[PDB]
Structure 1
């Protein structure tokens, strides 16, 4: 499979995760049968599903990378802010809105200061850095640039290492996804090596200990994925208890990744006519909690790995702006991949 296909699959899967997972975000628990009914209603026979903050930001991040042919924090920050100002009602978290509103100040002149000031200088560790980061791994091909620019992109709104390290991790998973066919063993191992190295930094260790998490929390969770995957049958309750399904990056980014890995194999609960990308998005949503973001992150990874061949037209064409999202992928491929 060729890499425009992976680029297109990445962004479309992210878009599907948002658009479809967003239906379940206010739900207590999620009924699997209801998710199955809903995705089946996308097919037939004989109204778009709206995207939210997660795709709005992912797009504005891509657009910045395209306009500058590189990461440029002043441009990206301004695009984030203007996209909010244009369409403020996409469903942004309250915390991120305070940052945008500071960014829209004429007297703001350090774009990283607003984010840094949040939670009394601790910064946010929510998943909003990670929800939008996929573009970084489509623009930057070296693992080093991916880490660097995923951190700085996240830092525009999420100044906590617990936040930006999750963005890094999600950027690395999509990066490794772009290399295609792997064992889940090999895939996790590579992710672990990177996060064990990142979480040894003194800032990451202070931030974890201050939160009272004792440290290397992304590394700890990547090891738990390891044991979940090698357990015969693991229930949703057990996944959510070990990994999380919440808004914090550490409760969502690893979960998105177990969903990707687990769903590489069939599941008798999910009709066997659904392909692996499909299964991933269904399974991701069925865990509840922060369904729009977990599924958009899991869709990003799945899409990069499986490509547009597993993105059905009926699903894709149900989503608001699926046409702009294909253009975004084609432009990124041309601007960054073709050379």
Structure 2
């Protein structure tokens, strides 16, 4: 497949996981039969699913990139804040709303300060930075620029390293997925090398310690994903206890990556009619918790990896704004990748 199929697939896959996963957000347990019914209802017998904050912020990030043809912290912060002001009921978390209201003050002449000040100066470690980050890996082909701008774009709302590191992980995952076919072992080793480095910085260690976490939450979960991929059967309870299904970035980003790697292979519980990308989204949603956001992040990776040949027209056409999403993906490819 061509890179353009991957760009289009990446943003469609993210759009799908948000649209489809929104119905189940903050549900502790999800019935898999309910999820199969929900997705099957997208291919009925001869209204759109609305997207949430994940997509709204992913759109803004992409649009900022395209408008300035580069990362531009001021532009992007203003587009996040204005998108919120215009449509605040898309399902934003309460934490990030506080940052938007501050970014909205005309005295605000440092757009990183609201995020940096949050939680008594420790910053948010939620996955709102990672939920939106995929486009950075479509704008920036080098791994050094992916980590740099994933970090920066995250820090506009999520200043804890526990937050921005999740964003970097997610973007790296997307980056690597664009290189296409990989063993799950090679994909992880690559991610691991970057995170073990990043989690050694002082701020990373200090932020973990402060949370009492015996540290390297990302590296230790990447190591666990490999362990889980080698096990005959792994239950949802096991995934949830080991990796997580929560709003904290370290409880969702590794989990997203697991859903992507695990769903390369057939699942007896998911009908054989569904392809790898569809299985990925079904399975991620089926874990419960932060279903929209885990599924949007698994969807970005899967979409980049498998490309449009696995994005079902029936499902894509069910999502709000799919044609606009597709135009922005084409535009990213034209502007950043072509030359």
Normalising by structure 1, report the TM-score. Answer: 0.99
Structure 1 consecutive aligned stretches of length 4 or more whose deviation exceeds 2 Å: none
Aligned length: 339
Q: How far 1:28 moved relative to its partner?
A: 3.1
Residue 237 of structure 1 and its aligned partner are, at CA, apart by: 0.3
> In the alignment, what sits opposite 1:56?
56
Shifted more, 126-135 versus 86-95: the winner is 86-95
CA deviation string 1:274-299 (max 9, x = no partner): 10000000000000000000000000
In the TM superposition, residue 45 of structure 1 has moved relative to its aligned partner by: 1.7
Q: Could you tell me how far 1:214 is from its partner in structure 2?
A: 1.9
Secondary structure of the corresponding residue to residue 334 of structure 2: helix
Summarize the Cα distance change of 1:225–1:308 in structure 2 as closer, same or farther, 3 Å threshold.
Answer: same
Q: Distance in 2 between matches of 1:28 and 1:225?
A: 21
Which structure 1 residue ranges, 5 or more long, are not aligned?
A: none
Greater shift in the superposed pair: 27-36 or 176-185: 27-36
- How far residue 210 of structure 1 moved from its aligned partner, in angstroms, is 0.7
> What SS is found at the alignment partner of 1:223?
helix
Q: CA deviation at 1:46?
A: 1.8
Q: How far does residue 70 in structure 1 lie from its aligned partner after superposition?
A: 0.3
In structure 1, what is the Cα distance between the partners aligned to 2:217 and 2:28? 26
Q: How much does 1:27 deviate? A: 2.6
RMSD (Å), alpha carbons: 0.6
Query: Which stretch of structure 1 is more off in the superposition, 22-31 or 187-196?
Result: 22-31
**Structure 1, 42-51 or 277-286: larger mean CA deviation:** 42-51
Q: How big is the shift at 1:6?
A: 0.2
Q: Deviations over 1:137-186 (max 9, x none)?
A: 00000000000000000000000000000000000000000010000010
Residues 41-81 of structure 1 deviation map (CA, whole Å, 9 limit, x = unaligned): 10122210000000000000000000010000000000001
1:313-337 superposed Cα distances (whole Å, 9 cap, x missing partner): 0000000000100000010000001
In 1: Cα distance, 2:66 partner to 2:229 partner? 38
| 1:252-291 CA distance string (max 9 Å, x none) | 0000000000000001001011100000000000000000
Tell me how far apart the structure 2 counterparts of residues 147 and 213 of structure 1 sit (CA, whole Å): 23
Matches of 1:235 and 1:196 in 2, distance apart?
Answer: 27
Shift of 1:94: 1.0
| 1:236-260 alpha-carbon deviations (Å, 9 max, x no partner) | 0001010000000000000000000
CA distance in 1, matches of 2:303, 2:152: 24
Deviation at 1:26, TM superposition (A): 3.9
Residues in 1 aligned to 2:265 and 2:150: alpha-carbon distance in whole angstroms: 29
How much has 1:221 moved relative to structure 2? 0.4
Cα deviations across residues 103-137 of structure 1 (Å, max 9, x unaligned)? 01010100000000100000000000000000000
Segments of structure 2 that go 5 or more residues without pairing to the other structure are none
